[PDB]
């Protein structure tokens, strides 16, 4: 969960929205077991 | 993700995770954040 | 850089309070505290059971802010902060013990003790000066006539900020100027569960 | 160097209290109780809030006289009722008799008594300034009381003159901790902070900045 | 920093496109290329005259724009680019071969290729976030097949760069933010006069 | 003496349970734990917050009786004991998880399992006959088929107490026998909070 503290300053002649992505991706650690047959396609 | 359509072709999965951030906004703006993480059994937080 | 009261360490986690808006208008604040973080966290539940502790502090101020707005804040540290009924006499429970959320100045230039604030540098400081720097970092040790008492009883010093320099800023930018506060109790102790 | 510290800064005796006996009059008691206070005046009360912790022993001397100045030869007994013990009563009560009030006999026609007074509190030092509840109460701290010193005229019944003391405190081996503020407001209540609603400036106003 | 394609240097001068206006609307470009290079230069008439060549690439994607605007973008070198015509069938040449002018992507998010734009991180890639940084710089081996193969019917890799977060701006800001792109062969080979 | 159960160590504060009064009609009890202690203590407290958790117990039953009094009990620790429902079907959840005030069997002689009471000799026992001894220990080490587990969900197993030999006295003796039970959880872990 994101939650805003304090609040999005500017100064004057600054556009006031803004973005943020978010990247994911798995460890050196994980592992994969079994087999499947994906239900994407 | 590339990780969650891979972890299609599996049964199960196990290991540990990894997520980044990039703020996209003006050079000119401050502010802050807050970024909390829940524990599987525990329900999310209603509050900061 | 860091400043270190009375030259002291407090030998023998971060808890982030919410943020208050520094309006161009508004008096200041001070938070009074080993009581800010009875109310919360794991800290809160051993300051209830426990029938004395000793501890020390290590509190952080920062103020985010743009290269357009101007302003200036003094942050002290000030140790048996006691506060006054000014006449037309008690202080109320809600002055003389704010909570989490802090208490607002009645009267900024006496910093209601009756002392002045123009010598309130005596006591451990800090400067803000919006241009100069954003943070004011300040180290406490543990201060009292008796190497233990209680935590919901006493309060051994206070946490003051104040806006000596109003805030000024051209039209167009942000109204309010968020400043935000984080305690790391160092060095804690406790007896009698 | 030496002249402005801490140890020579609170030096000399000054007058804590002035007190009198009166037996004469429609009041016939012929005794008086003064509880010890260092602040009992505003000028000194204000130097030793230069601190929030001292420490220190003090030093009492009774000077008395009649009214007319004149001080002829008669006996006076003065107690001292340490914290935490009873009160007389009246001139005759047997709290005068009680062995562990230490107690000085001195004439009116002697030079002045004069005793010592231990550091008295249960703390390392007295604390000036105390913030929270100790159980109206707010800062308000019973560790600081010095004990009690009751005075009377050693009579049967009803000698007719009054007796004016007056009570000179010197303190001694004194220890301060962490300054502060010099107030700037004038004092109203005795114990309290409390200062009146109309703000007084520190420095005194002139027409223009420019001079 | 520099970035190396698959850990490989392309081991066996600086032309300098157009510019291209980005428009806070705009959907982004792709260069797919041996291709640009054909037509322009004493490269592009080496491309002509030999029937076979084998050459690596360094390409630098430069952005000029201020503090005040901000926005994002995802530059990639993706080999064997092949792109795809929607339904209501074939891409035109246009589309297949777009020149030394580029191409604008009609579909973004699937980079025309049927393929998402999520994972087009798996490709060699830089950001370029107005904030942080204004240029991205790779550098791409050969890769084909074969040793040898030709440079009018074959592009060996696509450049892709897909404005990922819109450009905004204040009123009063340059409207669109000139983004160019600069192309240095290294260790070009040819046969076959 | 102590048992120690399948001969190993549990490697990786005393609760005292309120006392169950044994009279010459009774038909045994069963405690069923990781669980007593989940309502009860600061071993209570871990066993909500904490995801998953490792522990092995040491458990002590007592039984204060004079010499004129007589009769005999088997002491028992079952791992995975599972309570079956009879037939004129499933067991209430007040049988599945009796609390820290535990549960009294309705068919001594099957253990509720199906299972006859004369082969759970197989299980570590101790038998506490009132001539001989009044006291029975037992050490349980974790077993489990998984490293972690869950306090609330899954019971690692149960102790189980039967009157074999029912109580016997002459007019004028207490009616009833006091039995107590005494719990020090050994090398707990938590994790997950």
Same mark, same amino acid.
């Given at each position: ?40 396609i | 993700t590339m990780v969650g359509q891979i ?12 997520? +980044?951030?990039?703020? +996209?906004?003006?050079?000119?703006? +401050? ?15 209603? +509050?900061? | 850089?860091?400043?270190? /009261? ?7 986690? =971060? ?10 208008? /508004? ?5 009074? =505290? ?29 103020? &985010? ?5 101007? !302003?200036?804040?003094? @942050?002290? %540290? #000030?140790?048996?902060? @006691?506060?006054? %009924? ?23 230039? @006496? ?21 100069? &720097? &954003? ?19 006493? /309060?051994?010093? !206070?946490?003051?900020? #104040?806006? #000596? ?17 984080? #305690? ?10 | ?6 140890? *020579? ?138 004990? *009690? ?14 007796? *004016? ?8 081996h004194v220890r301060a901790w962490v300054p ?32």
């Amino acid at each position: 969960t994101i939650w805003y503290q304090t609040n999005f300053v500017v100064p004057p002649d600054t556009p006031t929205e803004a973005n943020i992505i978010a990247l994911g991706a798995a460890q050196k650690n994980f592992t994969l077991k079994l087999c499947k047959d994906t239900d994407e396609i | 993700t590339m990780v969650g359509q891979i972890c299609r072709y599996y049964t199960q999965w196990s290991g540990s995770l990894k997520v +980044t951030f990039m703020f +996209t906004g003006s050079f000119m703006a +401050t502010g802050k954040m807050l970024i909390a993480y829940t524990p599987p059994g525990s329900a999310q937080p209603a +509050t900061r | 850089n860091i400043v270190l /009261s009375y030259g002291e360490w407090p030998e023998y986690r =971060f808890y982030t309070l919410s943020t208050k808006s520094w309006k161009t208008e /508004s008096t200041g604040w001070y938070w009074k =505290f080993p009581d800010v973080l009875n109310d919360t966290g794991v800290f809160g539940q051993n300051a209830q059971f426990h029938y004395l502790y000793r501890s020390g502090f290590c509190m952080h101020v920062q103020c &985010n802010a743009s290269k357009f707005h101007q !302003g200036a804040l003094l @942050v002290a %540290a #000030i140790p048996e902060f @006691v506060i006054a %009924a000014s006449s037309p006499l008690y202080p109320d429970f809600a002055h003389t013990n704010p909570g989490k959320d802090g208490q607002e100045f009645r009267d900024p230039y @006496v910093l209601d003790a009756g002392i002045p604030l123009s010598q309130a540098l005596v006591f451990p400081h800090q400067w803000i000066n919006l241009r100069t &720097n &954003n943070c004011a970092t300040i180290i406490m040790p543990y201060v009292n006539a008796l190497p233990f008492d209680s935590a919901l009883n006493h /309060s051994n010093f !206070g946490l003051v900020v #104040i806006p #000596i320099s109003p805030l000024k800023y051209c039209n167009g930018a942000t109204t309010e100027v968020p400043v935000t506060l984080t #305690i790391a109790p160092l060095n804690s102790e406790f007896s009698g569960l | 160097v030496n002249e402005a510290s801490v140890e *020579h800064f609170y030096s000399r005796a000054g007058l804590v209290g002035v007190v009198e006996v009166k037996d004469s009059g429609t009041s016939l008691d012929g005794y008086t109780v003064w509880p010890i206070d260092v602040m009992g005046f505003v000028q000194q009360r204000r130097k030793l809030e230069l601190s929030t912790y001292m420490r220190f022993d003090a030093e009492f001397t009774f000077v008395s006289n009649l009214s007319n100045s004149t001080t002829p030869g008669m006996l006076l007994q003065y107690m001292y009722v340490p914290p935490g013990a009873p009160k007389p009563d009246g001139r005759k009560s047997y709290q005068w008799q009680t062995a562990t009030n230490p107690s000085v006999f001195a004439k009116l026609s002697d030079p002045p008594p004069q005793v010592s007074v231990p550091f008295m509190s249960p703390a390392t030092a007295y604390q000036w300034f105390y913030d929270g509840y100790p159980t109206l109460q707010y800062g308000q701290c019973p560790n600081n009381m010095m004990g *009690h010193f009751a005075i009377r005229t050693v009579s049967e019944s009803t000698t007719g003159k009054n007796v *004016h003391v007056r009570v000179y405190m010197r303190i001694k081996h004194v220890r301060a901790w962490v300054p502060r503020p010099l107030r700037s407001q004038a004092y109203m209540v005795k114990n309290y902070p409390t200062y009146s609603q109309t703000i007084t400036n520190t420095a005194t106003d002139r027409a223009s900045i420019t001079t």
